[PDB]
Design a protein around this ligand. Structure first.
Ligand SMILES: CCC[C@@H](C)[C@H]1CC[C@H]2[C@@H]3[C@H](O)C[C@@H]4C[C@H](O)CC[C@]4(C)[C@H]3C[C@H](O)[C@]12C
Ligand SMILES: [Zn+2]
Ligand SMILES: [Zn+2]
Lengths: 196, 227, 700, 146, 110, 50, 153
DNA sequence: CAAAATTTTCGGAAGGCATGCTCTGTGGC
DNA sequence: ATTTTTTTGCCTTCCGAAAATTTTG
RNA sequence: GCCACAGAG
């Protein structure tokens, strides 16, 4: 019942807007060791629709099938992953700084799944080229239709991808979470009284 | 039995519920003879006589390999061989296969080759999922077979199915004493005059099980009007 | 218990829940009215009340029920609606606008006979022992009978072995829309069919229409790590490749190309497919954004249940199970009728407004409310008709039910008591033994084991037990937040590959997330229920075969109170019983103290109930309050019924409603079409506790 | 009845362990059900036979059974002695709940009292589970007649 | 054959191609896996249920005979346990089951 | 043929109750026991079985 | 490195063994270098030990994150009452007892801790900036595990 | 020998029937 | 102009589609 | 008059 050691828990970063990516296809562990992180070449994020789009260049030397891509897919050599940032409440991304656990609120979590925009582009180009040879007050949209329309019309934002920024983030999080200590107010039973 | 049996007898029902063929064995006091006769009428699927079915792809040739076993065949004592399994595979018309493709490798292996923009993969997947459900021995309509020891101690072989002629033509089964509760089957095999006895006997048995005690002259009249 | 929750009061409760709460839901479903001509015109129903003005302190006068009986009138109270609209250029609001007359149930909170002493009953020529719970329409007293249906918003898995197919059906029922969806097996493949979709859609295509775009994700969600499920389901993965659909837009095109849904506005085929997936495929699950995870997981769970049914046919759901059946009372039926009536009223009012507004010769905008009454009577008329004729025809929901209401039988006191609390089965034409007509063991304590008629309706129409309660609908969002707090990882951030490695959580049949420790979660939720932090009619039960914990919140579930047993000791002690007999510590205090709790059939499945105190082993979970609950009100007249044969008890339940005796205290002030009275009635020499409890010895 | 219950419990133990011998045409569950049903029918017949031979002369149900005017030996045995096994559609009481008949019995219980055997006579009064099982059988008969 | 493309976790299919050589190809993304010199097989091990030897236990305490086993190139046993059984019609000869005592490999004749 | 022993128990319970002066109970899975009613009947000069 | 480009074969378990392999699979996914009540007690003790060693392992390791799952309404704290998103600084402590059990005390309420669902896929944390001068989204590390905190009731 | 006409076999859908026999009441259109 | 079902089984006739067989070149 | 349920054997 007595405690032998305690790890303090701190919360900081109320304006960081920290996201979490979740690749549906890329596994975490291969064999017994952590897998190599894929290299990201391009990132896009629609702000009002919270659509994330991540481009990963796949190897062309081994297992590429240059003929099919160069013929009917206009030579696509990258795989794109699309996801929607779902707002989840109560999720904190935490790290450790000398047995002190620092938590930063997570804004959205995105389920990135493979996207095949070149297939749709080829389909619509085929439809246009086969329809133009021989052809043969209205905004009441609400709900999912309006969301799809506003996601389609709004343009992507070419985000500048970067790596190795963790040290500055850790410094500002530790600095922001070291000056203040908050005193407890609610009783143990009063917390259980409402929203258990 | 009871009222549904009367209902399905008095009309010419081509298919009934629980049809039973009571074959009388030539040798009735040996369990081994009864079991080896049962092996000739009870259907045995490919899955009952095979270790594995697999699909193999090579540099330019694609096939399906089946490994049958001989220990199970020997212990159950089926009069079945490897070439019999091959010709039974070919006789399954729903698989769309012919004898030119089926080949024998070793004493256990059977290879079913496939030759031809994506048809070969679909056709081999269909063949792989349909192959272990073919019938290599037994009658195609017999659901199951059991060996019943009667009151006097002699054994009879009674089956669920619609192949009366194939049961009574099977060696080891006396064809002159094999009967069926189904009536149109008896009409097709033995004629109308045996169908009349089948109607009369089945209705009389159904009435006597419940102890209704009806005089069988009424039953004879009903059978004569039906036939 | 019979002083608070009762047996006849159940109907009352539903009507109360219809008047105080559910009318607001019906209004807010379709509260807004637009105009075709003028875009600035809008009408907004902001509130609704029955039999009370917002201005007057005292409720408005109503004719007494006996006066309505004598004069062939309708016992009813006006419906008052607060309406905001535009008259010219300024928004104006008007309260207490009458749009019809709701026929009120007797002895409800809107009746004149509510909580009235015997002297006031004598002043109004009404018997104090009248059960109430019926509607006086045109002088005739009609009872809206209890309807029995399959559980709504739940997956029901059934199979036809003689036809060889399996299916999983969901009957989505929500105030916005009602629909039915099927996931069926055909030719070894799995398809999804709906009334709006013209052709059956392969399950891979409809799963790709949602957020899932990987075949590995589909196969991992449907099957998981089990090899046999993968072998069964791998055929359906090839139909996505055969029909060259690989992206979400392609599947949406394919689905929307074959939708028969007529729409007022012309809509794009892609947008039609998005609408069909969002609102039509599964009606009670809606998506307001680009995320389709909940719908995808619902369809995947249905497909997994279908696959598990195909692997072995013993994993189907029993339609005759009481936990799979829900009971519609008068409140739910009047709600589902008033929804149609209000939709027709809104359509007619919008047509009238468009007709008047198309005339441009009027400089001054007119008052729309002046044209309420010329439509409003229709509501009342239709309402009265749906209780008078008993025919129940609603083309919006394709519902053609008949015999919903019945003329209240007045052959005896127990006859009128047993006409109340009567269940009408869904399958009225089932002539098969051991189907819906069998007495399921699941109805022990919920439905009467003896009260059923002899004849063509034997086993179909049935009566409630003595000590039962029928759950009313209540909000589920606090329960959802409590689930998220208690340790349930949300469905939008868990792995699709490892979803079947641990227990899932199903709120009202919808997969809300995953739980690492199911037993601790169930114990904590039961502790919160027994303490009083959540509603006592919320049901928690863990199904180990499906690896799920189900939380049921919606109404229509049959419940039954039971004494809790902990550590081999009954939680109800002698001091509690002494307090209850002395006058304090009533049944509600028993509920708050955690001594008794309500168990429905599904929670009774995950339980172990002791019949008597002497039979308690340490493994028991609950204790029976009293056994003769399993016999209903009509069956309670039989003395020593456990010494009899069951058909004798059934015949007594049939013939007790035809016995000649005293009807009510005002039987000589009543003018009924046929009334048999006995000159010298006597109370029985051999009584029953049920006889005393239902006051049968007062009017024998 | 105690001897029959002990033997039935022994068969349940053998079935649960897995060394239960099977009938020539039946599986484990089928042969267990057949053996238990035969044992319970035998014990009902034995108790009925020891009941009928003891009733004295000028016993009205016995006289009415001897005449054939009304009733039978089975009805007298059910009124005075054990009612017997309740049979629904040729089998015992089906599992209405998950892997059990009633919540008043443990899960995976196949004891005679948990699947439709009424120890009590009609004179001694039926317990609530026996009452429910007898109601199930009577309802099946009523529906069949209807 | 149940395999999935590692790039996009979509199902892999086998096509003939222009060269006539089969490859594991993905219809969604540009990925192929040639199988020249590589074996691929998806084995479906069918379940095996125990079967009782319907002729076992019958070669105990029976007369012997001098019949050479058909596997003469592997062994030269002569004494074999033999017995007679009628498994056919009554107008055709009653068959003989006989097993070698050294090599097993039981066989029958008419 | 109908086996209504509960009817005989009702008759004896009613007889003993009307001789004793109190209404009796035929409550399911309980009620007034037969031995008490036989004792009441035999104390009043009637046969125990009614 | 090209071994990852081999056609992935999904995990297949026989139907009779699917309920038994779940322990082995659940332990293999992490790959560290009442009968149901007792089983969950053992699982909770193992989870507590695993959380302790995983917390000790990632001390001061760059680009190493672990996702906490706290209740959406934290206990109220006195203003320097405060909104749930307005908390800053130290709020509580993770405590280890002699039995090896771990408990998270926030304010004045003690709560449990468990490692929750086991994910088989890769997760990383991405900061985001929507500055009009230059919009950037820098990677900060990978998520290694997840813990869940539930009230002690 | 294999292309083309003729015939047979085989499915799924479309129809139909059954869902007792009599008898006594009411209530609403 | 969004949108449930509300028994269960048995039987013959029709009618393309595909398979089987014969018949022309 | 047509439907609709309600009962009786
Ligand atoms: C998969 C099940 C098929 C089944 C319904 C088919 C396949 C075999 C068929 C029977 C045989 O043909 C022999 C008979 C022929 C007579 O003409 C009519 C009756 C007869 C008993 C047939 C009835 C029926 O047609 C059967 C049982
Ligand atoms: Zn791919
Ligand atoms: Zn040899």
């Amino acid at each position: 019942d007595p405690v032998i050691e305690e790890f303090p828990l701190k919360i900081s970063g109320e304006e960081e807007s920290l996201h979490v990516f979740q690749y549906a296809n890329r596994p975490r562990l291969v064999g017994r060791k952590p897998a190599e992180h894929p290299f990201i070449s391009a990132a896009r994020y629609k702000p009002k629709s919270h659509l994330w789009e991540i481009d990963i260049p796949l190897d062309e030397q081994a297992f590429y099938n240059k003929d099919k891509a160069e013929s009917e897919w206009n030579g696509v050599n990258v795989q794109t992953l699309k996801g929607v940032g779902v707002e989840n409440n109560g999720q904190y991304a935490a790290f450790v700084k000398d047995m002190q656990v620092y938590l930063v609120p997570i804004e959205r979590v995105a389920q990135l799944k493979p996207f095949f925009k070149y297939i749709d582009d080829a389909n619509v180009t085929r439809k246009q080229e086969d329809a133009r040879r021989n052809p043969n007050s209205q905004n009441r949209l609400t709900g999912s239709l309006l969301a799809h329309k506003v996601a389609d019309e709004e343009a992507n934002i070419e985000l500048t991808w970067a790596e190795g920024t963790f040290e500055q983030f850790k410094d500002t999080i530790v600095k922001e979470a070291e000056d203040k200590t908050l005193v407890a107010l609610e009783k143990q039973e009063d917390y259980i009284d409402n929203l258990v | 039995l009871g009222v549904p049996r009367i209902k399905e007898i008095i009309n010419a029902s081509k298919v009934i519920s629980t049809p039973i063929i009571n074959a009388v064995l030539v040798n009735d006091n040996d369990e081994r003879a009864a079991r080896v006769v049962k092996g000739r009428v009870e259907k045995t699927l490919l899955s009952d006589v095979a270790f594995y079915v697999q699909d193999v792809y090579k540099d330019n040739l694609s096939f399906i390999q089946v490994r049958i076993d001989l220990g199970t065949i020997d212990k159950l004592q089926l009069e079945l061989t490897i070439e019999d399994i091959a010709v039974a595979i070919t006789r399954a018309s729903k698989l769309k296969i012919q004898a030119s493709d089926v080949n024998i490798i070793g004493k256990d292996r059977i290879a079913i080759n496939v030759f031809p923009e994506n048809d070969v993969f679909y056709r081999m997947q269909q063949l792989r999922r349909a192959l272990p459900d073919v019938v290599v021995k037994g009658l195609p309509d017999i659901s199951r077979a059991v060996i019943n020891i009667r009151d006097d101690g002699k054994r009879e072989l009674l089956v669920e199915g619609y192949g009366l002629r194939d049961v009574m033509c099977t060696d080891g089964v006396i064809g002159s004493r094999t009967t069926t509760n189904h009536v149109l089957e008896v009409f097709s095999v033995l004629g109308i005059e045996a169908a009349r006895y089948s109607i009369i006997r089945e209705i009389n048995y159904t009435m006597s099980n419940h102890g209704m005690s009806v005089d069988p002259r009424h039953i004879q009249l009903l059978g004569d009007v039906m036939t | 218990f019979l002083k608070v929750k009762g047996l006849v009061k159940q109907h009352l409760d539903s009507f109360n829940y219809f008047v105080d709460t559910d009318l607001k839901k019906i209004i807010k479903a379709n509260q807004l009215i637009l105009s075709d001509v003028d875009p600035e015109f809008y009408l907004k129903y902001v509130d609704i009340r029955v039999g009370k003005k917002s201005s007057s302190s005292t409720k408005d006068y109503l004719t007494p029920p006996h006066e309505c009986r004598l004069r062939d009138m309708t016992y009813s109270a006006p419906i008052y609606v607060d309406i905001e609209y535009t008259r010219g250029r300024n928004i104006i609001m008007h309260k207490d606008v009458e749009i019809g007359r709701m026929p009120i149930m007797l002895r409800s909170n809107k009746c004149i006979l509510y909580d009235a002493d015997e002297s006031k009953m004598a002043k109004l020529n009404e018997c104090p022992l009248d059960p109430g719970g019926y509607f006086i329409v045109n002088g005739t007293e009609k009872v809206i009978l209890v309807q029995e249906q399959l559980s709504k918003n739940r997956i029901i898995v059934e199979a036809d072995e003689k036809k060889g197919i399996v299916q999983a059906s969901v009957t989505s029922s929500t105030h916005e829309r009602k629909s039915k969806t099927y996931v069926i097996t055909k030719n070894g493949k799995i398809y999804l069919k709906h009334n709006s979709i013209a052709e059956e859609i392969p399950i891979a295509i409809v799963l790709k229409a949602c957020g899932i775009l990987s075949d590995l994700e589909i196969m991992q969600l449907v099957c998981g790590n089990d090899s046999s499920y993968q072998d069964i389901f791998a055929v359906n993965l090839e139909e996505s490749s055969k029909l060259d659909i690989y992206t979400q837009q392609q599947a949406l095109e394919y689905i929307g190309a074959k939708v028969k849904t007529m729409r007022r506005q012309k809509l794009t085929i892609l947008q039609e497919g998005i609408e069909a997936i969002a609102t039509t495929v599964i009606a009670h699950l809606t998506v307001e954004a680009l995320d389709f995870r909940e719908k995808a997981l619902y369809i995947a769970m249905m497909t997994r249940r279908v696959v598990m049914a195909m692997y072995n046919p013993k994993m189907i759901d029993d339609r005759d199970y009481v936990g799979n059946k829900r009971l519609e009372l008068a409140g739910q039926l009047i709600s589902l009728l008033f929804e149609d009536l209000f939709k027709k009223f809104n359509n007619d009012f919008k047509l009238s407004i468009d007709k008047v507004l198309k005339k441009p010769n009027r400089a001054m905008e007119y008052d729309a409310l002046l044209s309420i009454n010329v439509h409003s009577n229709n509501i009342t008329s239709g309402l009265n008709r749906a209780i008078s004729t008993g025919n129940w025809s609603l083309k919006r929901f394709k519902m053609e039910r008949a015999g919903v209401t019945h003329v209240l039988s007045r052959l005896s006191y127990i006859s009128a008591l047993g006409m109340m609390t009567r269940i009408s089965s869904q399958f009225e034409k089932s002539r098969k033994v051991s189907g819906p007509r069998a007495l399921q063991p699941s109805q022990f304590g919920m439905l009467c084991t003896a009260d059923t008629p002899e004849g063509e309706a034997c086993g179909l129409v049935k009566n409630l037990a003595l000590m039962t309660h029928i759950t009313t609908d209540d909000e589920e969002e606090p329960i959802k937040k409590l689930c998220y707090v208690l340790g349930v990882e949300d469905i939008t951030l868990i792995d699709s590959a490892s979803l079947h490695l641990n227990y899932g959580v199903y709120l009202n049949g919808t997969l809300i997330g995953s739980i690492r420790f199911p037993t601790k979660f169930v114990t904590q939720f039961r502790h919160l229920r027994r303490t009083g932090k959540v509603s006592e009619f919320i049901s928690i039960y863990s199904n180990s075969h499906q690896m799920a914990v189900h939380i049921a919140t919606d109404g229509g579930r049959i419940c039954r109170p039971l004494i809790i047993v902990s550590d081999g000791q009954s939680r109800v002690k002698d001091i509690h019983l002494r307090k209850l007999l002395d006058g304090e510590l009533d049944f509600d205090d028993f509920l708050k103290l955690g001594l008794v709790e309500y168990l429905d059939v599904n929670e009774e499945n995950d339980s172990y109930i002791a019949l008597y105190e002497k039979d308690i082993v340490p493994s028991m979970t609950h204790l029976e309050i009293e056994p003769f609950t399993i016999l209903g009100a009509v069956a309670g007249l039989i003395p020593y019924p456990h010494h009899n044969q069951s058909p004798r008890n059934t015949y007594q339940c049939a013939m007790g409603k035809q016995a000649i005796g005293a009807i009510a205290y005002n039987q000589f002030k009543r003018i009924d079409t046929l009334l048999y009275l006995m000159t010298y009635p006597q109370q029985p020499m051999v009584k029953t506790k049920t006889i005393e409890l239902i006051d049968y010895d007062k009017l024998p | 009845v105690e001897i029959a219950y002990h033997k039935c419990d022994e068969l349940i133990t053998l079935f649960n362990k897995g060394e239960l011998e099977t009938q020539p045409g039946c599986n484990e569950e089928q042969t267990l059900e057949a053996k238990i049903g035969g044992l319970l029918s035998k014990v009902r017949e034995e108790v009925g036979d020891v009941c009928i031979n003891e009733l004295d002369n000028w016993n009205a149900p016995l006289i009415m059974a001897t005449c054939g005017s009304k009733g039978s030996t089975l009805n007298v045995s059910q009124m005075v002695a054990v009612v017997g096994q309740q049979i629904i559609s040729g089998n015992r009481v089906p599992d209405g709940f998950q892997d059990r008949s009633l919540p008043h019995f443990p899960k995976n219980s196949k004891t005679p009292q948990s699947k439709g055997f009424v120890r009590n006579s009609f004179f001694s009064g039926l317990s609530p589970p026996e009452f429910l099982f007898h109601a199930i059988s009577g309802r099946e008969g009523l529906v069949d007649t209807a | 054959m149940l395999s999935f493309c590692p790039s996009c976790n979509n199902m892999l299919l086998i096509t003939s191609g222009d060269s006539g050589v089969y490859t594991l190809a993905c219809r969604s993304c540009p990925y192929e896996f040639p199988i020249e010199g590589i074996e691929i097989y998806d084995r479906k091990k069918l379940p095996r249920k125990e079967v009782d030897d319907v002729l076992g236990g019958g070669w105990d305490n029976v007369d012997q005979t001098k019949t050479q086993c058909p596997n003469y190139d592997t062994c030269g046993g002569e004494s074999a346990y033999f017995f007679q059984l009628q498994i056919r019609s009554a107008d055709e000869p009653m068959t003989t089951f006989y097993k070698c005592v050294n090599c097993g490999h039981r066989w029958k004749e008419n | 043929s109908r086996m209504t022993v509960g009817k005989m128990i009702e008759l004896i319970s009613g007889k003993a109750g009307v001789l004793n002066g109190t209404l009796e109970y035929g409550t399911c899975f309980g009620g007034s026991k037969l031995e008490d009613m036989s004792k009441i009947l035999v104390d009043q000069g009637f046969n125990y079985s009614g | 490195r090209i071994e990852q480009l081999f056609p992935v074969r999904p995990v297949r378990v026989r139907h009779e063994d699917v309920e038994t392999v779940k322990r082995e699979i659940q332990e293999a996914l992490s790959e560290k270098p009442g009968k149901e009540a007792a089983a969950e007690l053992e699982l909770l003790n193992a989870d507590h030990q695993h959380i302790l060693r995983k917390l000790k392992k990632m001390n001061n390791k760059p680009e190493r994150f672990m996702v906490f799952q706290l209740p959406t309404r934290l206990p109220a704290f006195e203003r320097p009452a405060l909104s749930t998103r307005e908390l800053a600084g130290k709020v509580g402590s993770i405590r280890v007892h002699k039995s090896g059990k771990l408990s998270v005390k926030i304010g004045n309420v003690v709560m449990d801790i468990g490692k929750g669902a086991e994910t088989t896929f890769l997760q990383d944390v991405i900061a985001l900036s929507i500055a009009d001068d230059a919009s950037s989204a820098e990677l900060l590390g990978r998520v290694d595990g997840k813990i869940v905190v539930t009230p002690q009731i």
